Amino acid sequence: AMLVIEDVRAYEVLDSRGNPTVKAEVTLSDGSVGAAIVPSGASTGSKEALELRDNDERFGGKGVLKAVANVNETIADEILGLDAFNQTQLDDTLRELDGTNNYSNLGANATLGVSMATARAAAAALGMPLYRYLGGANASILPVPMCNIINGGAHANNNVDFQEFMIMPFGFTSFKEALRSVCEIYAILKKELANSGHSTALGDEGGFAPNLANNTEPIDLLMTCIKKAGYENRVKIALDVASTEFFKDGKYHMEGKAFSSEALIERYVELCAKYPICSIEDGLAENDFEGWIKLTEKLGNKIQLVGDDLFVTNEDILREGIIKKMANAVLIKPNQIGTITQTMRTVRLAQRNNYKCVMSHRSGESEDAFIADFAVALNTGQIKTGALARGERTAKYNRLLEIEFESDEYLGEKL
Amino acid sequence: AMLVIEDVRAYEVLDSRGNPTVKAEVTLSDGSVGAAIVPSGASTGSKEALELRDNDERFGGKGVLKAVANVNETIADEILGLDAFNQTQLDDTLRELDGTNNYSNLGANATLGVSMATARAAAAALGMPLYRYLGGANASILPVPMCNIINGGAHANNNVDFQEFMIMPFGFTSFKEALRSVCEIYAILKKELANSGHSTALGDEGGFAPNLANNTEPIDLLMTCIKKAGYENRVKIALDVASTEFFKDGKYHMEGKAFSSEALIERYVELCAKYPICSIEDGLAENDFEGWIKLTEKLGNKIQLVGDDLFVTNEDILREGIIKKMANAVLIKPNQIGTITQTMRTVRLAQRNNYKCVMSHRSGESEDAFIADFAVALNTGQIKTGALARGERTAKYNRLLEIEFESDEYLGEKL
Amino acid sequence: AMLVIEDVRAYEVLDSRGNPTVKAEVTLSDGSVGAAIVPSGASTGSKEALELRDNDERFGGKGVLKAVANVNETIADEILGLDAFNQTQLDDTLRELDGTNNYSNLGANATLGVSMATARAAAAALGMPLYRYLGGANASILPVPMCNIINGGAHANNNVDFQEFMIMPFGFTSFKEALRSVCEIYAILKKELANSGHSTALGDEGGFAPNLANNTEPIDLLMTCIKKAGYENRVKIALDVASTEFFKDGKYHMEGKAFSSEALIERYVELCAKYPICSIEDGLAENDFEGWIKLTEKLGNKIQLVGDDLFVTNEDILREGIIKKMANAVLIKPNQIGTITQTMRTVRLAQRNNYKCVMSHRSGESEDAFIADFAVALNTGQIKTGALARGERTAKYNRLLEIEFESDEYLGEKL
Amino acid sequence: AMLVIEDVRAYEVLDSRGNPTVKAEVTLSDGSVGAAIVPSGASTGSKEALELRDNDERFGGKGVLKAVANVNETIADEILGLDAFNQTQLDDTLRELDGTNNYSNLGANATLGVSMATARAAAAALGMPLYRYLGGANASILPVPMCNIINGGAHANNNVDFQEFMIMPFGFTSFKEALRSVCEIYAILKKELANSGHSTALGDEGGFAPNLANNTEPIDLLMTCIKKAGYENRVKIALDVASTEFFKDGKYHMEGKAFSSEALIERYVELCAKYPICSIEDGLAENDFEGWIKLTEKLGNKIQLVGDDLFVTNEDILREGIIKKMANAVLIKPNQIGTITQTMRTVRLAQRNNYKCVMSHRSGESEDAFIADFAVALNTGQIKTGALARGERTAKYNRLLEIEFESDEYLGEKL
């Protein structure tokens, strides 16, 4: 082995909502250090990989001291002396040590931080950028971002049922010019809101949560801001419906109605005919398997249909989805699965079977921009990393602006 | 010269509000690299160091391509080959190259970034943390934070005159426990706001801007939340009144009145008698010199009186203030003055003359945590770096949690 | 730049058929050296990147002294001092230096060798295997080989119209066992041929060219050998028809008849219904656009349809093929396009649009196993590199056996 | 010891006929790596050093898993920590560890791999070409190749008795021009066979096996091709009769007859009177001692007489040959004897006693070109490494073309 893991440590830091999370730091035998901050995920649930939370008097039960302990003691003891450069061996060792199928022992907050930290340490020792370490010279594509600038659903307290209303800048030949257009549109939206007596205060991802009437008003507002900014036809709309949040008893409860699966599908067809929606995430619920099958038949050749809660970044669940023809794209949330290698597996599966991958943030983020490198490393072509404000979101865009001096490839509207 | 500056560059990145700002990167002759991002400043005004803005069609007038060109061409040409370790010579060269008394040639956004980036590159060459590079083995004190968790004034659209309502965790023997307290109190406040029908969406610094009635309602709310959290007597209140914003025709226009300077002082005496306010910033206007003299006589021995707009991190203006006995503390905003050395000169003058220094963020921040290390390097004992949310604020608290593993001295209530 | 290209040279070597070709060697500023040998291409044609041949009295007009001089003089002069690790800038520089759309100035045999040699040199400098240099930690899949063990058409002198009859070992969980199976099937074929009085002497790719009656006898013989070897149901059949070779006057002349495009497609339907054929390459001619659209409608959901002459590894021609729905896979011959970057672009375009990539050899190969690393770097999942004999074929299989000790993932029949 | 052997391993790869062989890899304590592939030999026999073969269900009984194990376990355990640069000590240790006179224990395929691999690793550590490591600055002579371009005997299934019909380019002042002459002659031979209805498919060493009528018809064809190519009198003919293959009950069964030793000798005399045959290998059988003595007396001062099966590269057998005046040259096959030092011992014996050495390939070769370096290292002046086709042959020619840029000395016709 060329270099080995010499030291590993973790400690408690704060995420962008002010809750604790794990930072890990790995030192190699040449003295190269890498570190990484894990975004916040879910500590209960039977599908997702689980993060460990302390549930004691500190920080409202949200301390991560046990996750931190598991890195400093259990993981440390198992990985010191492993080859720094064999990411797959490190990640498989983490899985085997945990011994469950959802990291319910070590905690995904313990395993991901160590997984990302080791990769960074390896890249540092080679003097190479992280995206080159993860994806080689083939790492090239700067992703088209989808930028959540108007919020509703559970992400707000309004009458808007849909969770995320996003703008996507396709009509550009460079990432920086694309980034500039969404920045300009966001500024215009802020003004439009202020001038009609709405709050300009921000939600967790940097977007606005004004109390609008329904699910089409926010779209109309995006359209008029896009046009006023001078980008008509070059910026399109993406939605995250998060339909599991309002699915009860076989029905979807929105817009004062109780919708059937088939009726909600017809609603999306309607919306897609009237507005330049290019993508819809979680249009149907995470267990509405029959509905998704229909959704994909009706719209899967016209628009992107992204599984988030449907697939939870999980290779096996995505495989069954691929087989049964559900969706045509998958949100990629690395902490949801627990190591960089398992994330890569899910992405490779999707890309071998015509599913697009959207590298994704979490609601509780950090200053760590790992997912900007990851999106380029795997040529995802898409990233979902927030509005154009709040440092835990702008850190990712800034990283992508850096990577752009070395590899400036942006697909925009090109195949 | 041991190592020399070998390369200097800059490029446009985004600050935490979605406006462009400068990131600079300096490479030394051993290959060590340092980078820094500059927070947003003022591009107009007659007192402060000015940042350069392009004022063209991009980003609503706020592009920084001229500043960036100033790093890439003008500064680079001048500093290539200078001793990496002579910060003072670097910063003095920048001042001379600029040739003005307010950086209105190079732009303070061009000079600060290079000043910061060179310091990080020198610390990296030595394998030393930034705070050790800046302040040596004498760097020791983890500062007490003042955290802006309720906003008013120009920072919101309410009936509240004062700008910032802050909590300061004095009653603790460690920084980690001090920070926990403010995080717990912030979470409690978030919940109180939500249950009382206020928005929990955030202002620029991560605080809330509810439409409250007056200037004491916000204080009462902080007090309730402090006690509910279990930290009664251990956490005090600081204010930024930003009184220049309501000073007109010799009078202060607040609480539906027109106060003379004398009347406003006795109002502060009242407030300080009723509540545990330990610090008031810009209690009087930036040009109300007579008022400041009287205020300082009246409360200067009981509470901290911070000059922000009064001093603008400027050594000369501070010197006159000391001589005239105005204030007993100074807010330190490095980008206001334009280099690290000029910042250190202002701090040293203050500390030689019994004025406390509060190391400060700006409204437009980034993921760069320089001011955390800077606060420790200079033993300021206090920092003002935002609420306990938004990554551009939590990055500083996190950096302070890392520094604490090497130097854990927290003064708290100790002399 | 960490390391820069310090030296570039070339010289004439011999390919696996005894003709000259270009060997290039690149030295970096730390002393690291990479070398590569270019497979032989086409010095005429209207679509392909051209290789320069001397056309003098040496080597029957096939000298490459002008290609060699282009590396030693023109390319060298231009790329000395360029950043070793920026493959894309290297390859874009080679393209621009050339100035044409098909390397008809420098020659693709001049540019590919330097392109590959720089990549090997950068990988050696980092102590990294080439596949990790090219595809990072994400480089993982060992490809399923398609092995050309019976020949016909222009690659023989017989009644067989089709050019290549190949076996593909799908039914295995490891590459080594898959490879053993095809070696075992190959040895059995050899014995069967010898016992029937056929020659066991080899064509250019290591396969046999017995004088068989038609296009189905070779397939019947492959099935018999698959079964005797013990691998029934685990090894499938792939074909390269190379139909352009018998396309004349809008018809295909084979099996003693003149087929319409439509009639030839129906022959493939019949063949596929009777035999386990998983892939057909150049089933229709390189210019039979309407036929390919029909073929792809008819069989593209059931079998792999590989464009070789159709696409000539060219991203622009492939892109039109995607838009026009022709084929669902593409043969990747790096020397056909001229740089490793242009190769990666064609592969990325393919993989974004649901086309499979088959990393391929040429008839004139060398001991250079670059395409083995390249297949793994880009997770192509498939490779065509010859029969299981002749060192210029076995060098690639051996390289894949070496890569297998570091990443052993073999998909086989898995999605 | 400047460096020591730090790691030793082996694994199965494929030879050029598609059978397993051993690849060995040796790493030194500076991290320098050397690797080597063993050509195929004999698992049985009472004269040659033996290669170990598995004899189980894998690869028709040709697996080398036991050889591989002997490298990874027995050898490794014995040589780890030995001086990297003491080639003689390493090779003697291998011989001692084996404890037989014919490597029947470890297997010659286990020991030669390690022997070559260590030499390459030492050369790499010194930054020197292998031929310099083995032969120093005195290593100079590029060998005259004998190129087997028409096959008979056991190497085909024709009515041709002799095994190899070779061309040798003496009439040139550079190796490259000699190599070009043989490439051009081979191309002309290919055309001649294709126009007279013969197969152009290749045998194991890259030559053709047309069904000719006797042993002079092939020579006639070589002469025609030499003259048509324009190289008359500059290229000569060398034969390998491999007469042991047809020797039985005292006599030599060829051309429908049983020849006495003396009659076969008179046949060589006739053949050498009529054609420019400069060398004959194994003209008489391996145990026909009285015959060899007469053949040597008769033609030994006129033509080269090479022992292959007569001497099996074995020092002791050659020594007795020298004493009894049998042959005037020895074929040198390193895997036949089992280490580089032992190979060297045999060559030095020969060169001290006026025996010419022909560095030789095996019919199961690999991409490894060790024997090209070895020929130059020892100034053999002659090499037999196949036809001008197939990668496992052209790899050697190419390596000699590389060495020619550093040492261009070619004797050709000079003493």
Ligand SMILES: [Mg+2]
């Ligand atoms: Mg979602």
Ligand SMILES: [Mg+2]
């Ligand atoms: Mg202030």
Ligand SMILES: [Mg+2]
């Ligand atoms: Mg083809």
Ligand SMILES: [Mg+2]
């Ligand atoms: Mg022989």
